[PDB]
Amino acid sequence: PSLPERIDTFTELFNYEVALKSYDIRILQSNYPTKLLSPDSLLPQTSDYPLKDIQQLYSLANTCRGKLPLSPLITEPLVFTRAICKGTQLTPRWFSRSGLIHPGGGTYAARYVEKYPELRPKLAQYMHIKERDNEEGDELLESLQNMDDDAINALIAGASMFIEGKEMWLRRGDRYFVFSKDVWQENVANAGLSYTLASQSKSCFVKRGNICWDVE
Numbered sequence: 001p002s003l004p005e006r007i008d009t010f011t012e013l014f015n016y017e018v019a020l021k022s023y024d025i026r027i028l029q030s031n032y033p034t035k036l037l038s039p040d041s042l043l044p045q046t047s048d049y050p051l052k053d054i055q056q057l058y059s060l061a062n063t064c065r066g067k068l069p070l071s072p073l074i075t076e077p078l079v080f081t082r083a084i085c086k087g088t089q090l091t092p093r094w095f096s097r098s099g100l101i102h103p104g105g106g107t108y109a110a111r112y113v114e115k116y117p118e119l120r121p122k123l124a125q126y127m128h129i130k131e132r133d134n135e136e137g138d139e140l141l142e143s144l145q146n147m148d149d150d151a152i153n154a155l156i157a158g159a160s161m162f163i164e165g166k167e168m169w170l171r172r173g174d175r176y177f178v179f180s181k182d183v184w185q186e187n188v189a190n191a192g193l194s195y196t197l198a199s200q201s202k203s204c205f206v207k208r209g210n211i212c213w214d215v216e
Contacts, residue, residue, distance in 0.1 A: 001192070003206045007213055010191035011161070011170060014184075019177035020167065023140060025158075026174060032144065034156050035100045036107070036128050039149045044105040049073055054103060057081055077103050084115060095126035106131060150198055154209035162209030163197060169209075192216045 001009070016022075035041050046054045053069035057077055060066055064085035069078055076098050083090050095109050102108050109126035113119050124132055129144050147155065147164055154162035160171050168184040169176050188195060196212045198204055204212035 003213060003215065006191050006193050006215070007206070007208065010187055010193055011172070013187040013190055014170065014177070014179060016170075016172055016177050018183065019179055021139075022175045022177045024175055025171070028140070028176070031125070031140075032129065033100065036126075037144065037152055037156050039152065041101050041107070041128055042105050042130060045101055045103045049077075049103060057103065060085065076108075080108050080111075084112070092122060092126070095123060098126075100126060148199075150210035157209075159209035161211060163195075163211055189216065 050069075050071050050073065053071045053074040056067055056069040057074060060068070060078075061081045061084070080090070080098075080102070082088070090108075090112060095112075098108060100107055100109070102111055107127050109123040110128065110131040113123050113127070120135075124136075129141065132141065132145070134141050134145065143164075144152065144155075151162050151164045155169070155176075158171070162169050164178070166181045168179050168181075170179065171177075192215060194214050194216050196204075196214075198207065198210045198212055201212040206213045
C-alpha cells in the first residue's frame with residue numbers, strides 16, 4: 001500500500017477513547033493565538049518597520065521625549081511606548097486587539113507587567129507562553145511550554161499529527177488526542193510504517209507535522 005495510505009491506516013488503529021488526554025481545538029486556538037506560541041515572536045521584529053521610525057521609537061522609550069515617528073505603520077508601538085512614558089493605563093481590551101508582539105521581541109503585555117507587576121494575573125493571557133511562569137499550575141499551558149520548536153510549530157500549523165517528547169498528538173475532528181508510546185509505536189509497526197523526527201531526518205520525503213514517515 002502507498003505511504004499516504006499507510007498513514008491513513010495508522011490513524012485508524014487508535015481507539016480515541018484511550019487517549020491520555022485531549023483538547024478542543026477551537027478553545028486552544030481562542031486561548032493561544034499563533035503569535036503567543038510561535039518561537040519567532042520572541043525574536044526582534046524591528047525589520048517589519050521603517051528604520052527611522054524604529055530609531056525614533058527607541059529614543060522615545062529611552063528618554064520619553066523627542067520627535068514622533070511619522071509612519072502609520074508604527075501606531076501600536078508608539079501608543080505603547082508613550083503609555084509607559086506617561087503612566088497611561090492600557091486595558092486588557094487594548095492588548096487583546098493589538099498585534100501582541102513588541103518590535104523588540106516578546107509581548108507588549110510582558111513589558112507592561114514588568115513595569116506594573118500587580119497586573120500579571122490580569123494580563124498573563126496576552127503574554128507569550130515562554131514569558132509565563134505558570135504560577136496557576138495550568139496543565140495545558142505547561143504542556144504547550146514543554147514543546148520544542150518543531151512540535152509547537154506543527155501545532156501552530158494545525159498538523160494532522162506530531163510527536164511531543166514520548167507522546168503523539170493526533171488531530172481527529174474538533175480535538176487533538178494525546179497517546180502514550182506504548183500505543184502509538186505499536187500502531188506505527190502495525191500500519192507497516194517507520195518514522196524519524198524531522199530534526200533527525202536526513203531525507204524527509206513524506207512529512208506530517210514533525211514526523212518523517214517511511215515504510216517499515
